């Protein structure tokens, strides 16, 4: 009780000093960030040596007082003095004490049952240990060529996110009292908020610590590291024990976190979405963004939107680049061409147009590049370095591991090189590859012959032979490349040499973004053709625990099931704004208006007519018995409500299974039609998901009843509205302007509001109108 009083009196003393008073008054609160930077700048010159000098003394250490007197005896066992009443050296409320007392309280101290609290705070570290438990071992030795520079996620963890948003999570989970109300992350990514805030908020221990450790928990460290060719981010945590220049170890890849495959699943998701945008070429800009913002991903423990995964994902695939290009995410330093990845290390030049002949006696324009340019090629199990000058490869070296992958590197990079022989081979190219069939769209030519090579096996041999072939001289024996990808060096290709080893990958920290052309082409950096149109033509539909919406062009939607699910979505979505909606009715305790709601009449005809009254009786019963506060489940009210509309008859027959066009919805008992999720706010109707954030008091949501309750917004500061703590905000009803302290000290006012709507579309439609 005096803990606040003494703080108030301390403030009185401080503002009584004018020198501190004016510097406390003048300026924003941000000056604290500077003020803290003005202290304890002095550091000792010697890292260990000064510490040795420190521990030499018997009572060097600064330690707290109150806790020790509370728990344990200050005096010693062996009669070596421990405690005094004197505060010496720096003057702070801590009194000095000997080092060994720490060991004593670690021995005989009276503490119990801290075990479970520790681990899930440090689950980053504890997990990095758990993974080492399951692996097996083998030892050998070799002269090993490691891949020298890869920038690769190390210490990977599920639900990894950017630094700013993880700072938001930090603020929300640490303390509610001072926090800003942060829309973008909390609205979309809620349910990780529920978990983290739930486990860490109830037991107030080591607030700062837990914060700064959670910062590192979700932050994969991507550094520039040597790897020996196992690129899974789990092996990156401990490379040292595994591999090195002379090192080798075995039996690893098996154990991994669930992230590594989930990322690939997201790559397939972006594949299907980009195909959906490919189906209709009327406009590719307006549709794909809809397909993005609509889709909802289910991560193993959490539901998260596709937008915040795409924009903020680490790995840039040829597809992922396309999915990001629709949004405002800037990810550069990546070149994607077909399956191959590329990086540009040198030179520059302009795109020029040259019309060259095919074998069908027809002329088609080819856009080529004249530059002296040195780029690094990247393909599966193979790396290389190429340099092109004036539309023809100048210098080439291959660092690839496998012969076939070497040949693929050579080929693809010849396609991007576009020599004259590129025109000479045209075996039936025009009949199909010339005109891609999509609304009669002519597909670019580099990708045309790329696809011609991806077609069959002999097409690779064609252009492989299109390069000059010569018997290589002695001294090139090891560097020479056969037609089939080997080193025998009897016959070899011209202007190419293999290297024994791998080839290092360049890295640049850069962000570049520009809008995309209507054909799924990204002209970013005023050129550079990074989007590679369609990378791979996989026609397949397979998904697991994935959500789609809004005329997806994939038919998962039955007529009866869309009647049920949309009928529910009317009720769930349309309510929560104000009076004559579910929240005000629940606060009034009046459930009769809730029965008569016009959105229930929409759902009425879909119920089974036989038991309609028999269902309505038990339904009305359940809704009425939950009107008493604290006993009501807020999901069960949505589940049970639609059947209450009809006149209750005394059935005496059990109404557990409610047939709505021959499909049952049970109380509790999450099923195909109605999925009732535990300990988070959501729900699943077959292959799709919906939830309503602003007003949920459902009893299991206790941990965030302060975060979830917000549908509010800011209006004006004019009324004098009693200053209400965040826990007092649940009581003030609708249309009530109230005053609240926000964040780091800025105070604003709100009312019960219709939520912020059309953050994007509001601008997008007008921008489309102005053309």
């Amino acid at each position: 009780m005096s803990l606040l009083l003494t703080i108030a009196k301390e403030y009185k003393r401080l503002c009584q000093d004018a020198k501190a008073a004016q510097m406390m008054t003048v300026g924003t609160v941000s000056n604290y960030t500077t003020f803290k930077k003005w202290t304890t700048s002095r550091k000792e010159k010697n890292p260990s040596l000064r510490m040795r000098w420190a521990m030499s003394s018997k009572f060097p250490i600064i330690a707290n007082k109150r806790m020790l007197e509370e728990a344990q005896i200050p005096k010693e066992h062996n009669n070596v003095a421990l405690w005094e009443d004197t505060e010496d050296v720096s003057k702070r409320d801590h009194v000095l004490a000997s080092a060994s007392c720490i060991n004593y309280w670690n021995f005989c101290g009276p503490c119990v049952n801290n075990s479970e609290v520790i681990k899930e705070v440090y689950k980053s570290r504890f997990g990095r240990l758990e993974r080492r438990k399951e692996i097996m071992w083998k030892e050998l030795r070799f002269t090993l060529v490691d891949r020298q520079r890869r920038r690769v996620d190390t210490q990977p963890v599920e639900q990894r996110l950017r630094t700013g948003e993880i700072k938001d999570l930090q603020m929300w989970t640490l303390f509610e009292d001072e926090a800003p109300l942060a829309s973008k992350f909390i609205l979309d990514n809620y349910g990780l908020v529920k978990e983290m805030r739930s486990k860490f908020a109830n037991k107030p221990l080591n607030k700062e610590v837990v914060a700064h450790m959670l910062e590192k928990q979700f932050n994969p460290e991507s550094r520039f590291l040597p790897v020996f060719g196992a690129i899974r981010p789990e092996r990156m945590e401990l490379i040292h024990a595994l591999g090195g220049e002379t090192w080798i170890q075995e039996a690893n890849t098996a154990g991994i976190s669930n992230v590594d495959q989930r990322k690939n699943d997201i790559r397939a998701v972006c594949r299907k979405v980009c195909l959906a945008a490919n189906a209709s070429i009327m406009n590719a800009k307006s549709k794909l963004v809809e397909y993005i913002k609509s889709t909802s991903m289910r991560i193993g423990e959490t539901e998260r939107k596709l937008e915040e995964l795409i924009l903020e994902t680490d790995d840039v695939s040829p597809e992922v680049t396309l999915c990001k290009s629709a949004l405002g995410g800037q990810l550069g330093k990546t070149l994607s061409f077909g399956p191959m990845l590329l990086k540009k290390i040198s030179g520059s030049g302009v795109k020029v147009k040259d019309t060259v002949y095919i074998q069908g006696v027809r002329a088609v324009q080819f856009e080529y590049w004249s530059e002296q340019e040195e780029f690094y090629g990247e393909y599966k199990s193979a790396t290389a370095l190429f340099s092109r000058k004036e539309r023809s490869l100048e210098w080439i070296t291959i660092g690839g591991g496998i012969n076939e992958d070497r040949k693929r590197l050579l080929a693809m990079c010849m396609i991007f090189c576009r020599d004259g022989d590129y025109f000479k081979d045209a075996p039936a190219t025009i009949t199909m590859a010339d005109l891609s069939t999509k609304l009669g769209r002519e597909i670019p030519y580099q990708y045309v012959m790329m696809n011609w090579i991806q077609k069959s096996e002999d097409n690779l041999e064609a252009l492989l032979y299109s390069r000059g072939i010569v018997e290589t001289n002695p001294g090139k024996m090891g560097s020479s490349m056969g037609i089939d990808g080997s080193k025998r060096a009897i016959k070899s290709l011209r202007a190419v040499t293999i290297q024994s080893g791998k080839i290092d990958m360049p890295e640049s920290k850069e962000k570049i973004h520009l809008e995309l052309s209507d054909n799924l082409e990204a002209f970013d950096s005023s050129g550079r053709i990074v989007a590679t149109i369609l990378d791979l033509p996989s026609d397949k539909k397979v998904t697991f625990q994935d959500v789609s919406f809004q005329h997806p062009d994939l038919a998962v939607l039955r007529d009866e099931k869309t009647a049920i699910t949309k009928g529910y979505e009317a009720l769930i979505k349309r309510l929560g704004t104000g009076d004559n909606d579910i929240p005000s009715l629940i606060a009034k305790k009046d459930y009769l208006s809730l029965y008569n709601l016009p959105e229930v009449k929409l759902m009425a005809p879909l119920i089974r007519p036989n038991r309609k009254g028999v269902y309505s009786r038990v339904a009305r019963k359940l809704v009425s018995t939950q009107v008493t506060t604290g006993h009501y489940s807020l999901h069960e009210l949505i589940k049970v409500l639609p059947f209450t509309y009809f006149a209750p008859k005394q059935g005496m027959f059990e109404g557990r299974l409610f047939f709505s066009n021959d499909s049952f919805v049970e109380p509790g008992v999450n099923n195909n039609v109605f999925s009732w999720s535990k300990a988070d706010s959501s729900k699943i109707y077959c292959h799709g998901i919906a939830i309503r954030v602003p007003l949920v008091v459902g009893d299991e949501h206790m941990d965030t009843s302060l975060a979830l309750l917000e549908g509010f917004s800011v209006c004006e500061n004019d009324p004098r509205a009693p200053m209400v703590t965040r826990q007092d905000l649940i009581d003030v009803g609708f249309g009530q302007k109230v005053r609240l302290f926000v964040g780091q000290g800025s105070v604003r006012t709100f009312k019960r509001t219709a939520s912020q709507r059309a953050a994007s579309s509001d601008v997008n439609k007008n921008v489309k109108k102005i053309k």
Partner: protein
């Protein structure tokens, strides 16, 4: 961190809404950052408009702000057609079809009045003017917008305000006609003058240099400028075979280099005591329990051999022996004052203010001079010191080494085994002995500097060792003990603002006749006679041998106390250098060659009878350990100059190894820098001469070098 403006804008704002800011910002006005400002305002309008459609296909509002200028003019004349209202000169943002009036929206950071009086001054009552503050302050014309759009726009402006606070962009976002006009860099007349006379060119005014810079286009005249620069630079073509001699290596001439190590190694003598855990745990009381033995009886005679200051050292020795009886602090306040500073005298300082008269009348013979170190010559004894530190001492190990961690089959078996073997080899050597005594005693001094500052204390010179027996009877026990090299004395430990250096007086026992050449710094006495015996298959009585007492004074910097206090580092630098050799070999054969490489691989070690000699890698490992330990002991600025300029010699040598025709440009200058860093340092000159012999033998193997 965000590196660009588009990053900042697209981060908190809508992606397509930024593009209008970029485009409008490209042409009509030219400012790079201000996109963010209109990035707010523009979007502030859009959410405003879309919200209401008035009972018709046509929308309630129309947006003239985001469009193009010339198009916005005519589209604003459309309103003169439709509603026939006065054609206002100022182009507004939005036109309402329900209210049929002009609408414009400002956004200000400061209190709303400051800007609202500005815009209201511009357009008066002719338009509906709505001025919002990010903080929730509101200023308006007569009627406000509908209650929903108020709430949404205010929430957005609040969140955007919080983002700007997090990125700390505030004064720059201020309204154009107030703060934008002062975007300029403050120009003071002092700074403008300074800049105007700071210019390199014949031009004086900065504006002319600015013009020559911005308008610069270089012609290809730097080829003739570079060839004339080439003609001016006549020299530095370089050929190895022409300079391949390198005039061997120059070496200084003079007196033989002395013993610079703070302790004596080869000639030092030991006193064995089987240690008690509770008695020896102090390590200060170690000598107090030593004195109950025969140590207390030894006394030197007044007439020393080769002593500089005999009577002083003898008296101090008696003060040590008398102190050890009572307590290990020496109480003499007058004695230490002269010995301190390395017989450094405290010199009285006369202020300059009173000194002017003493310049007018010159007295005390006023002058100024500095002194330089006298160069020495290549040491002989150093080789014998190396050969003594190389062989295994009878005591098993001198260096505390912690326990081994638990092991898994794969690596930790290899690592643990390699450490067990290498540790087992290097612990028995005498080099490990000097390492151990250095760690233990310099640690003792390190504690004594915190314990008793400004006090005189008697610190022992000791090393701990447990005895090995491989005869392999199960036996009573292996002997665990500690032995004493000598006694040590510490002076005032006070710490200056600039660097202080403590002074130390070392007394060591020796069984060996002193050599005036290398011991010149040491003051030797005739101490007594010490009994030494052995037991063998022969008779081996052993008689007695005379005991000499070596004394000296040295300076120890606190930094030296630290780096010499941890000598264990040497092991690591040996380990790596050894271990790599075993891997690089074995990794060739893809087999475990480590054990085979250690024993089989031959390393050239020394020369005997004019023949090059080599030893296996396990015993030649001692050579590397001794070399690193000397690097730790003997390190001087001279040594670091020597090695850092020596790497060039080594790289040229291996350049001639693989016949790469290496060259370095002014080898006379390189050998002058190598010569410059050779003065008195024994290790420096030693590695110099050994480098000479390396050049000779290498030139004999094949000649890219010279032999005199």
């Amino acid at each position: 961190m965000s590196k660009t403006f588009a990053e900042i804008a697209e981060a908190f704002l809508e992606p397509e809404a930024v593009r209008i800011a970029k485009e409008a910002v490209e042409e009509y006005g030219d400012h790079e950052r201000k996109i963010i400002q209109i990035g707010i305002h523009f979007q502030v309008c859009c959410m405003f408009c879309d919200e209401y459609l008035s009972t018709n296909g046509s929308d309630r509002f129309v947006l003239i702000e985001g469009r193009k200028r010339g198009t916005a003019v005519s589209l604003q004349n459309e309103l003169c057609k439709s509603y026939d209202l006065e054609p206002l000169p100022f182009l507004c943002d939005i036109f309402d079809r329900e209210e049929k009036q002009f609408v414009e929206i400002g956004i200000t950071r400061k209190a709303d009045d400051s800007y609202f009086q500005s815009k209201f001054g511009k357009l008066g009552n002719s338009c509906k003017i709505f001025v919002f503050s990010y903080d929730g302050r509101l200023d308006k014309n007569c009627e406000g917008p509908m209650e929903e759009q108020k709430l949404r726009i205010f929430s957005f402006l609040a969140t955007a305000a919080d983002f700007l606070r997090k990125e700390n962009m505030f004064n720059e976002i201020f309204l154009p006609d107030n703060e934008e006009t002062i975007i300029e860099m403050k120009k003071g007349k002092t700074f403008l003058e300074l800049r105007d006379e700071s210019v390199p060119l014949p031009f004086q005014t900065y504006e002319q240099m600015k013009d020559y810079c911005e308008k610069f286009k270089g012609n290809p005249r730097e080829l003739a400028s570079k060839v004339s620069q080439m003609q001016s630079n006549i020299k530095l073509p370089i050929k190895h075979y022409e300079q391949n001699k390198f005039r061997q290596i120059r070496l200084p001439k003079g007196p033989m280099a002395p013993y610079t190590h703070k302790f004596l190694m080869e000639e030092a003598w030991m006193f064995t005591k089987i240690s008690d855990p509770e008695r020896s745990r102090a390590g200060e009381i170690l000598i107090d329990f030593f004195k109950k033995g025969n140590l207390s009886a030894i006394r030197p005679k007044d007439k020393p051999l080769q002593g500089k200051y005999p009577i002083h050292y003898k008296n101090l020795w008696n003060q040590i022996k008398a102190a050890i009886a009572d307590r290990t602090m020496v109480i003499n306040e007058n004695d230490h004052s002269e010995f301190l500073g390395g017989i450094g005298r405290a010199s009285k300082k006369i202020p300059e203010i009173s000194l002017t008269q003493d310049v007018i009348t010159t007295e005390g013979l006023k002058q100024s001079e500095n002194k330089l170190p006298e160069p020495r010559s290549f040491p002989r004894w150093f080789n014998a010191e190396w050969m003594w530190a190389i062989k295994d001492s009878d005591l098993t190990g001198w260096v505390p080494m912690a326990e081994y961690p638990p092991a898994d089959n794969e690596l930790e078996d290899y690592a643990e085994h390699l450490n067990k073997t290498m540790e087992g080899v290097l612990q028995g050597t005498n080099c490990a002995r000097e390492m151990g005594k250095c760690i233990l005693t310099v640690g003792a001094l390190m504690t004594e500097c915190r314990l008793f500052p400004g006090k005189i204390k008697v610190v022992p010179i000791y090393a701990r060792s447990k005895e090995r027996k491989s005869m392999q009877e199960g036996l009573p026990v292996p002997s665990e003990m500690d032995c004493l090299f000598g006694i040590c004395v510490k002076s005032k430990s006070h710490l200056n603002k600039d660097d202080g250096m403590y002074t130390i007086i070392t007394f060591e026992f020796s069984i060996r006749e002193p050599n005036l050449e290398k011991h010149q710094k040491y003051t030797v006495f005739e101490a007594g006679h010490t009994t030494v015996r052995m037991k063998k298959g022969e008779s081996v009585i052993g008689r007695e041998v005379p005991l000499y007492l070596y004394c000296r004074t040295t300076a120890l910097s606190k930094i030296k106390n630290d780096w010499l206090s941890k000598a264990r580092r040497c092991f690591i630098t040996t380990m790596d250098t050894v271990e790599t050799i075993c891997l690089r070999e074995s990794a060739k054969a893809e087999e475990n060659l480590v054990e085979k490489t250690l024993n089989e691989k031959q390393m050239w070690i020394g020369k005997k009878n004019g023949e090059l000699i080599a030893q296996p890698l396990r015993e030649a490992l001692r050579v590397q350990l001794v070399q690193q330990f000397y690097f730790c002991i003997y390190n001087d600025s001279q040594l670091e100059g020597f090695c850092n300029e020596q790497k060039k010699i080594l790289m040229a040598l291996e350049g001639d190894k693989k016949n790469k025709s290496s060259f370095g440009f002014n080898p006379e200058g390189l050998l002058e820098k190598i010569e410059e860093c050779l003065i008195n340092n024994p290790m420096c000159l030693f590695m110099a001469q050994r480098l000479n012999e390396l050049v000779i033998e290498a030139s004999k193997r094949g000649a890219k070098f010279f032999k005199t």
